[PDB]
Design a protein around this ligand. Structure first.
Ligand SMILES: CN(C)C(=O)c1cc2cnc(N[C@H]3CC[C@H](N)CC3)nc2n1C1CCCC1
Length: 260
């Protein structure tokens, strides 16, 4: 066999993911995920995106015929944040890591692919300090979920920029912003901070009415994220817009004055 399983990374959600040895290619570490026609189209898309070899998405090495073979990265964002020396992440490091993130996201959005579960645990940091995206394109924590996903209203690309706002905040605080035990609790936490949207912004034909949430004003963001720039504040707000339509795009965000 070309691969020897040595460890189980974890997840176990869609399937069991193993860290192995690529015996045929110099014993480099790889990540394996052993897993109808809707799945066959899911992998065709991954193989297709590998052709452009974007630097800010994890590399897909092979598809054995069913196991998927990715490069292994030893580290994720949470572990980087765990082990970052106090006072924490230099603001210039935040800017670049973010820039790498939106570049990966724009690449995916451009080819009409949504991550749908963008969290710090499937954001990889290579030894070279490069950002790589993982665990997307194949069908527990709600802390990074867009309001539309929670409300079961829309599941479009704006969802992934909501998650980016959440992560952007977490790079200063080094603690998650919205920690909900459930979808409604999650929704509660969000509206405590960003405030109650207008009725025109609340999607129609949805279980949860705007009237299940009370006294929600609009807390200034500096209170939750300190040592944040004016330009960073501007960008964070356009990402954490309640209405997916009024929310900024990855392409549009890559041009924001914050990055200059
Ligand atoms: C479909 N798969 C398997 C991927 O997209 C993929 C390629 C990976 C390459 N390196 C890593 N590293 C892990 C990050 C977390 C930390 N414990 C160190 C191990 N995860 C990869 N992943 C998944 C596994 C779960 C998180 C994202």
């Amino acid at each position: 066999q070309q691969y020897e399983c040595v460890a189980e990374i974890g997840e176990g959600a869609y399937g069991k993911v193993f860290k192995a040895r690529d015996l045929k290619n110099g014993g480099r570490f790889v990540a394996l995920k052993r897993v109808p026609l809707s799945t066959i189209r899911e992998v065709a898309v991954l193989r297709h995106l590998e052709t452009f070899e974007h630097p800010n998405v994890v590399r897909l090495f092979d598809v054995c015929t069913l196991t998927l073979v990715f490069e292994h990265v030893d580290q994720d964002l949470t572990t980087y944040l765990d082990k970052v020396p106090e006072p924490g992440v230099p603001t210039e490091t935040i800017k670049d890591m973010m820039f790498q993130l939106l570049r990966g996201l724009d690449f995916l959005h451009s080819h009409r692919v949504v991550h749908r579960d963008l969290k710090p645990q499937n954001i990889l940091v290579t030894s070279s300090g490069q950002i790589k995206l993982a665990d997307f394109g194949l069908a527990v924590t709600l802390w990074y979920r867009a309001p539309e996903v929670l409300l079961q209203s829309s599941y479009a690309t704006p969802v992934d920029l909501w998650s980016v706002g959440c992560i952007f905040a977490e790079m200063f605080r080094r603690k998650p912003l919205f920690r909900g035990s459930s979808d409604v609790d999650q929704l509660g936490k969000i509206l405590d901070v960003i405030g109650l949207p207008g009725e025109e912004d609340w999607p129609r034909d949805v279980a949860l009415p705007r009237q299940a949430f009370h006294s929600k004003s609009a807390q200034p963001i500096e209170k939750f994220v300190t040592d944040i720039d004016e330009l960073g504040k501007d960008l964070l707000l356009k990402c954490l817009t309640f209405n997916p339509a009024k929310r900024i795009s990855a392409y549009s965000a890559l041009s924001h004055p914050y990055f200059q």
